[PDB]
Design a protein around this nucleic acid. Sequence first.
RNA 1: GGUCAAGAUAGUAAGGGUCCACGGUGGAUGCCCUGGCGCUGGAGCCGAUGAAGGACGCGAUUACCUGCGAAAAGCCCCGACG
RNA 2: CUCCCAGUGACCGAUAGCGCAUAGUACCGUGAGGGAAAGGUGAAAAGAACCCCGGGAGGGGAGUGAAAGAGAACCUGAAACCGUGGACUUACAAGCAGUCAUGGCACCUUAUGCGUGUUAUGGCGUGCCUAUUGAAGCAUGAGCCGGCGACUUAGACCUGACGU
RNA 3: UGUGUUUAGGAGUGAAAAGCUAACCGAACCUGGAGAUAGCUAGUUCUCCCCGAAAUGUAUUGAGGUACAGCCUCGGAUGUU
RNA 4: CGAGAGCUAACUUCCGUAGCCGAGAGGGAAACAACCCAGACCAUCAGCUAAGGUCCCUAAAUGAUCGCUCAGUGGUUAAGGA
RNA 5: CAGUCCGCGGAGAAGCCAUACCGGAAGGAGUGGUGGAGCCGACUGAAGUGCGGAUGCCGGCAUGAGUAACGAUAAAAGAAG
Lengths: 115, 129, 57, 117
Amino acid sequence: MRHGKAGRKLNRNSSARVALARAQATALLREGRIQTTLTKAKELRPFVEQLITTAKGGDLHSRRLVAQDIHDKDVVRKVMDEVAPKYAERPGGYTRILRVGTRRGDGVTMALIEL
Amino acid sequence: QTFRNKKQRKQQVKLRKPGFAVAKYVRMSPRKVRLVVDVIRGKSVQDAEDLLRFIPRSASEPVAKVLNSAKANALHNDEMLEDRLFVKEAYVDAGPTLKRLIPRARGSANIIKKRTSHITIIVAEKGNK
Amino acid sequence: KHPVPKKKTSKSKRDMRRSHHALTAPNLTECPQCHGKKLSHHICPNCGYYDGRQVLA
Amino acid sequence: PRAKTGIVRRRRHKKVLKRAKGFWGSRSKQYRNAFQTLLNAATYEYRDRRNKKRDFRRLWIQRINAGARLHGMNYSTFINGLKRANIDLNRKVLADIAAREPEAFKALVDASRNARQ
RNA sequence: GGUCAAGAUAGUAAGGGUCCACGGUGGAUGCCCUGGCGCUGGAGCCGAUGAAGGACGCGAUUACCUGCGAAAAGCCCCGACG
RNA sequence: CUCCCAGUGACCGAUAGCGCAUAGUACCGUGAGGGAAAGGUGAAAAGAACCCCGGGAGGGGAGUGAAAGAGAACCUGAAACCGUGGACUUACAAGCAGUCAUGGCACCUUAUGCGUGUUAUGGCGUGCCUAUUGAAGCAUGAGCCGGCGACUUAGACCUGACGU
RNA sequence: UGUGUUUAGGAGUGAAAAGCUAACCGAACCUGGAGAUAGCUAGUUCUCCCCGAAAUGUAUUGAGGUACAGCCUCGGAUGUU
RNA sequence: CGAGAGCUAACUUCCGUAGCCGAGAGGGAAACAACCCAGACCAUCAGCUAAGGUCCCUAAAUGAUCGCUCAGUGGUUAAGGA
RNA sequence: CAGUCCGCGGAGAAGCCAUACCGGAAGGAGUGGUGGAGCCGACUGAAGUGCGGAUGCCGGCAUGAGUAACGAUAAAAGAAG
Ligand SMILES: [Mg+2]
Ligand SMILES: [Mg+2]
Ligand SMILES: [Mg+2]
Ligand SMILES: [Mg+2]
Ligand SMILES: [Mg+2]
Ligand SMILES: [Mg+2]
Ligand SMILES: [Mg+2]
Ligand SMILES: [Mg+2]
Ligand SMILES: [Mg+2]
Ligand SMILES: [Mg+2]
Ligand SMILES: [Mg+2]
Ligand SMILES: [Mg+2]
Ligand SMILES: [Mg+2]
Ligand SMILES: [Mg+2]
Ligand SMILES: [Mg+2]
Ligand SMILES: [Mg+2]
Ligand SMILES: [Mg+2]
Ligand SMILES: [Mg+2]
Ligand SMILES: [Mg+2]
Ligand SMILES: [Mg+2]
Ligand SMILES: [Mg+2]
Ligand SMILES: [Mg+2]
Ligand SMILES: [Mg+2]
Ligand SMILES: [Mg+2]
Ligand SMILES: [Mg+2]
Ligand SMILES: [Mg+2]
Ligand SMILES: [Mg+2]
Ligand SMILES: [Mg+2]
Ligand SMILES: [Mg+2]
Ligand SMILES: [Mg+2]
Ligand SMILES: [Mg+2]
Ligand SMILES: [Mg+2]
Ligand SMILES: [Mg+2]
Ligand SMILES: [Mg+2]
Ligand SMILES: [Mg+2]
Ligand SMILES: [Mg+2]
Ligand SMILES: [Mg+2]
Ligand SMILES: [Mg+2]
Ligand SMILES: [Mg+2]
Ligand SMILES: [Mg+2]
Ligand SMILES: [Mg+2]
Ligand SMILES: [Mg+2]
Ligand SMILES: [Mg+2]
Ligand SMILES: [Mg+2]
Ligand SMILES: [Mg+2]
Ligand SMILES: [Mg+2]
Ligand SMILES: [Mg+2]
Ligand SMILES: [Mg+2]
Ligand SMILES: [Mg+2]
Ligand SMILES: [Mg+2]
Ligand SMILES: [Mg+2]
Ligand SMILES: [Mg+2]
Ligand SMILES: [Mg+2]
Ligand SMILES: [Mg+2]
Ligand SMILES: [Mg+2]
Ligand SMILES: [Mg+2]
Ligand SMILES: [Mg+2]
Ligand SMILES: [Mg+2]
Ligand SMILES: [Mg+2]
Ligand SMILES: [Mg+2]
Ligand SMILES: [Mg+2]
Ligand SMILES: [Mg+2]
Ligand SMILES: [Mg+2]
Ligand SMILES: [Mg+2]
Ligand SMILES: [Mg+2]
Ligand SMILES: [Mg+2]
Ligand SMILES: [Mg+2]
């Protein structure tokens, strides 16, 4: 049972759970919005919010702590110098989800995630 | 108010099928298709237009197109008023069946039924009542 | 091993089994900022407004 | 000359299926089981036609002793008193119809009881 | 008629059943024949001047069948039809 | 004798009839070899211009036609089997599915009745065949409907009944 | 281990299991004899009328099968046996 | 019923004999080929009975008279005791 | 199926479909509805002549059932067309 545990596998192992979180982070930071399945978007939101608050420190340590999860340099500069200083005033809550509705192939209910 | 024989009735009364549309040979299980076709049935043809559009089944596509043709020949051919139209009738019967061989373990085959579908819908004016 | 069903299942009991496969019609509701219908807690597919316009199309 | 079965068989079949039309399940629609259910149906038919007299005789007697005891006699004593006078030779069914007309039934009860004294 | 008591008693269908009506399926049934079977009776050998059976190929366009063969859906002489 | 030709038939007529209404093809086999389903617009193509919904496919109109209750998935179109609609019904019921009886509802084209459909309750009631001393059997066979499917022919024979 | 090649049906091959011989080898496969034989099993369909048994005796490479009696039926005669 | 074989076992096996069942429906024996009654041509919402029954289920005397058993014997044996 | 009669039929045959009628049964009629081109009745003759069964054959359609699975656990994600 999970009478307190937290998270989701997304039908994958540990390193896969991990790269998926890191790479959809990289994408919605690269592009400000992406559309993806509703589950995986609820997954992504706490990850990427933690990460933007990591980048809100300014420092070389904060940028290296982000560099570990986001290994395309240009996004690291965006999130660090462009986006986290933008959210300066925000006490947390740097993302939203609205749900675009259902896909045809697999009948998933996809949604949008933006900032 | 009736003719001599059926040979004359065939010539003078030509028998039309108002509100009627049918989509033959739809490559789909009927069993699946009736699942939505029940939802539509008896309802306002605009609610059919909307219901059919969010129910999340592959079978909703062909049952959509037919519904339009029903309303189409309800309006172009039959002089009916579209603010009356509604789904007086809807049903799907089974068409023919593609049979295919499928290999299975230890050298036996089986036969597999790709059922087709004859969807059919008949709209009519909500002038009843 | 290898359980099988015994007697062929009758039309009537089959239908009582399928008694629960009734589909649930979506609770549709019309977009305040447009014509058409939209699923609740989703954006209007036709217009794209969730409050301003949200999706592109 | 060939002479295929053809139209014969299906005439016979439809006759059976037409006898079997109240019946449940394939006792109504397949021939084989239709004909089979009709086998036991024939048995039960021929039984009941002469058992139904048993049941109705029961119902007559059962209704007669009711008025018998209603007056303070009973079936055994009451028919023994309607026999003890020779002149009563009506069937039990007519004693029932009289049990539906209380005045005449009581007249026969006093007649019978004036014959076992 | 209002409240309380005791008692009796409907209707509802998720889905079902019997019957009726309208279809879908499927290709039985009748009818037909473009195809067979048998008997009777005819006729009865081909081949080294190349058989039987084939393989390529021939057509404005030709995958299959026919017919035909680099003179190749064919060439010449006679007769018939018109 | 009959590869082949004609004629004929108390011969078949699409599961029949040759395996083939054509094909020794498809397909199966390394091979020798095995080996299928078969069909039907209509008189004539007049084989549906044009319009409508749909990428289609399919369909509705219009026309052609005697018939489109023939439209190329084109004669009829039975049964299983799948549905749509309407009558009567069904959620304290124990049940070889029926049988007779009584009541309730519906209906009236061999039909206002010694009625048809349905139904509630009461009584009654051990599928079928086979093989058996003995079958509801927990003995065999069988998913269901269709259709193929078994006491024949022969002979200068023997024997009996009947008839000429 | 490749290629090519030779050896086969009571025959081949076998460092021997009756193993292998084109995915069922104490005798392959195909075509045929051929509709082998089957005292063994199962199956044998339209209706009504009349009559109605046997599971006994003896014989048998016989005992779950046959022959002859015994019992059934149809007709003729006899004529109360 | 009469024997053998058996253990005076067997829904045992083998003979004699009668009846039923096989080939037999109908009432009784809760149920039940064999037991007890009784051999179904057909139809009736008619009558007398057989076996078996008459408190309710469940048709039909809570019948009558002299007792018997107070054990639920009735509704599962014996040697033996009281 | 055949011979011979009697006939019927595009104002419509067989076949198919309902049906409360009729004979003692196998069965057969009446009326209605499809169908669209052959066919009933009587007498006789010949048969490949009557199906529920054969783990029968050819065929179609059910039940299991919207069930098991979708063929290696080398994952996939965003944009844009
Ligand atoms: Mg998964
Ligand atoms: Mg923090
Ligand atoms: Mg006209
Ligand atoms: Mg087909
Ligand atoms: Mg197991
Ligand atoms: Mg009975
Ligand atoms: Mg109260
Ligand atoms: Mg039909
Ligand atoms: Mg011919
Ligand atoms: Mg040559
Ligand atoms: Mg050329
Ligand atoms: Mg030359
Ligand atoms: Mg000429
Ligand atoms: Mg053939
Ligand atoms: Mg056929
Ligand atoms: Mg052949
Ligand atoms: Mg080939
Ligand atoms: Mg089409
Ligand atoms: Mg048509
Ligand atoms: Mg037609
Ligand atoms: Mg066509
Ligand atoms: Mg024709
Ligand atoms: Mg047709
Ligand atoms: Mg109740
Ligand atoms: Mg129950
Ligand atoms: Mg019985
Ligand atoms: Mg035995
Ligand atoms: Mg059994
Ligand atoms: Mg079995
Ligand atoms: Mg001789
Ligand atoms: Mg003589
Ligand atoms: Mg050999
Ligand atoms: Mg040797
Ligand atoms: Mg081998
Ligand atoms: Mg021989
Ligand atoms: Mg013997
Ligand atoms: Mg003898
Ligand atoms: Mg004598
Ligand atoms: Mg002894
Ligand atoms: Mg014994
Ligand atoms: Mg014995
Ligand atoms: Mg016997
Ligand atoms: Mg007897
Ligand atoms: Mg008896
Ligand atoms: Mg007893
Ligand atoms: Mg009893
Ligand atoms: Mg018995
Ligand atoms: Mg018996
Ligand atoms: Mg016994
Ligand atoms: Mg006695
Ligand atoms: Mg009596
Ligand atoms: Mg007595
Ligand atoms: Mg009583
Ligand atoms: Mg004692
Ligand atoms: Mg007519
Ligand atoms: Mg008839
Ligand atoms: Mg014609
Ligand atoms: Mg004919
Ligand atoms: Mg035969
Ligand atoms: Mg049989
Ligand atoms: Mg069968
Ligand atoms: Mg089969
Ligand atoms: Mg499951
Ligand atoms: Mg699964
Ligand atoms: Mg697997
Ligand atoms: Mg991609
Ligand atoms: Mg982008």
